[PDB]
Design a protein around this ligand. Sequence first.
Ligand SMILES: [Zn+2]
Ligand SMILES: [Zn+2]
Lengths: 116, 60
Amino acid sequence: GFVGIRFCQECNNMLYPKEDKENRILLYACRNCDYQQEADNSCIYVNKITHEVDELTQIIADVSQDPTLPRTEDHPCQKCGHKEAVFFQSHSARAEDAMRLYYVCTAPHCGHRWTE
Amino acid sequence: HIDQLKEREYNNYSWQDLVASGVVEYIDTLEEETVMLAMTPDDLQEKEVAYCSTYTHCEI
Ligand SMILES: [Zn+2]
Ligand SMILES: [Zn+2]
């Protein structure tokens, strides 16, 4: 789980958390306005020390139409089942220790991505 | 193009003709990073183990 900023309703500014001492609940107040709203996530901050980020969420379907990207036929797609597909490393800095590939289907209207 | 160029000097044929015809193209240092350059036209395209088979340009 993560936590999102929820802007104010009148002034449209950041809402800081506030522990209601009276009703013993969690509120999000505005410094400028006096808007209040009852919380539902019951969380404020999370820290990911390991930074376990799913590289698939960053990969886009447009990577398929890459003229300078390798292609293989031995890893067909799942949904459409097309044969041609691309593969590449994380292509992101801070890579801890892994060259695990991220196969992406090379076919229009599919944009599927997987990993083996 | 080769036949028309080999008879240059005599008539009027020059490099501007090749550029206008759409055969050559100026790629700068910044754009050279997003093209599959090829070294020779014949050797690197015939039919072998599937390397890229998506060459976009080729060096002279
Ligand atoms: Zn406000
Ligand atoms: Zn597919």
